[PDB]
């Protein structure tokens, strides 16, 4: 659910502001059919134009920037991660309706749900860079692990207190 | 798409009279004459083949009619409807025209 | 240039595995109701197979943000498999005795 403002900056490599100055025309940046582009995962919201003076060792340069606003389209990731993780959580819930005497059945269901959740977690981050902070997807998948784990621990506790301990 | 792209046009300056009506000449002289600046509007990093020599030919008829052919591999955009995928069908364009010269 | 996609690859490769997974899930209705671990294995393995197929089906396409016909087919097959598992859950809920017929 992230939005970004991607820049495109240009200036003069050698001529500082005292030698070359840039100006935006009245019709600065034109676009055609915006929503027919190759932005598969993103939607173009708009754009804007800016001018600035940037100091460097060689001098001060007039940098002109065009920012494009892109809002992520969440449908692909809904198909890829959110729906499978929820379905595996519901699969874990199905164990509660199985008879508690079906020990191999319920244990296999719980552990297989925890396997599929690990698999979905690792597939979730394939499209992203290796950032070292939690994202909303990581949080969702992580809470889904606690739910599938807690279900397995619930059955383990129930079995131990019903049969093994007594 | 791999194409022989042929363009022909009149040039009164290149009229001549000689033993043969058509001069099938080396492609290096094509740089020494005017040729149209055709480009592909929806192209994406096309390549002009140059093995062993530049794959072009230029021919000048006695009446000043020039023929000029190039060998290209054109990589062109083709926007797609993927809602009927894999039952989908497309109409990929190939659009070209002059860059600098208006109608 | 008008192009039509050939469905044969996807028929061999995605639709047939999904159909056979659905048939495999439906096979569990013919086992006795007391084979609880066996029918649970059927349901769970079919659900995970459908999840894996859904994940692997989208690798061919670019990451577009809308559902395709293949996506709808996979979703319906997943619904069928999960319905089979819920059916077994109901059958086991209404099963009384933990032993099968002795013969």
């Amino acid at each position: 659910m992230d939005e970004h403002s991607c820049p495109l900056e240009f200036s003069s490599y050698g001529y500082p502001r005292e030698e070359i100055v840039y100006q935006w025309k009245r019709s600065s940046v034109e676009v055609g059919d915006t929503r027919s582009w190759r932005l598969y995962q993103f939607s173009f919201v708009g754009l804007r134009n800016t001018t600035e003076v940037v100091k460097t060792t060689s001098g001060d340069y007039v940098v002109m920037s065009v920012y494009f606003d892109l809002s992520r389209r969440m449908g692909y990731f809904t198909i890829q991660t959110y729906i499978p993780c929820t379905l595996i959580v519901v699969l874990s819930w199905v164990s509660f309706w199985i008879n508690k005497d079906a020990v191999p059945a319920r244990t296999s269901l719980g552990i297989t749900t925890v396997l599929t959740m690990t698999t979905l977690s690792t597939i979730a981050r394939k499209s992203l860079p290796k950032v070292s902070y939690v994202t909303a997807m990581d949080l969702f998948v992580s809470v889904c692990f606690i739910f599938v784990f807690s279900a397995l621990v619930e059955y383990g506790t129930l079995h131990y207190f019903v049969s093994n301990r007594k | 798409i791999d194409v022989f792209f042929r363009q022909s046009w009149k040039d009164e300056r290149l009229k001549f009279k000689g033993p043969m009506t058509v001069l099938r000449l080396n492609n290096l002289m094509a740089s020494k004459i005017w040729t149209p600046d055709t480009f592909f509007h929806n192209g994406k990093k096309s390549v002009a083949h140059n093995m062993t020599m530049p794959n072009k030919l230029l021919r000048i008829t006695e009446d000043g009619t020039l023929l000029y052919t190039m060998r290209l591999t054109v990589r062109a955009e083709c926007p797609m409807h993927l809602e009927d995928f894999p039952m989908d069908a497309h109409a990929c364009p190939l659009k070209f025209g002059s860059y600098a010269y208006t109608r | 240039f008008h192009l039509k996609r050939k469905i044969g690859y996807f028929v061999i490769q995605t639709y047939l595995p999904c159909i056979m997974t659905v048939i495999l899930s439906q096979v569990s209705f013919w086992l006795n109701r007391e084979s609880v671990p066996a029918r649970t294995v059927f349901g769970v393995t079919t659900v995970l197979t459908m999840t894996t197929l859904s994940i692997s089906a989208r690798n061919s396409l670019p990451k577009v943000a809308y559902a395709t016909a293949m996506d709808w087919f996979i979703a319906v097959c997943y619904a069928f498999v999960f319905s089979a598992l819920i059916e077994f859950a109901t059958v086991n809920y209404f099963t009384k005795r933990g032993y099968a017929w002795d013969g």
Partner: nanobody
Amino acid sequence: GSLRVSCAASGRTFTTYIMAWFRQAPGKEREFLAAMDQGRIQYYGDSVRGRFTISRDYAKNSVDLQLDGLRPEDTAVYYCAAGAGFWGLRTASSYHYWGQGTQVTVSS
């Protein structure tokens, strides 16, 4: 005289369509008039070349047709079509969306 016929659309994520205009005179025949691409390329029929000009507002999702040099033979009902040009871009069968249509008449 001069006239302008506008045609607006909405209710779709689908964009990649050519948008075109067709004409029906008394006699039940469809006549392609103009079309505009996603690349802003304008195709025109030979009969109405240089007279009618097509344009598209992509943000508003509309196609406009400015009609100039009208004559009595131009009286007809005009239909707006939008679709992907498959085997077409000049034949009506390639467009899967059509409008109600608008009448135009010239009186001398």
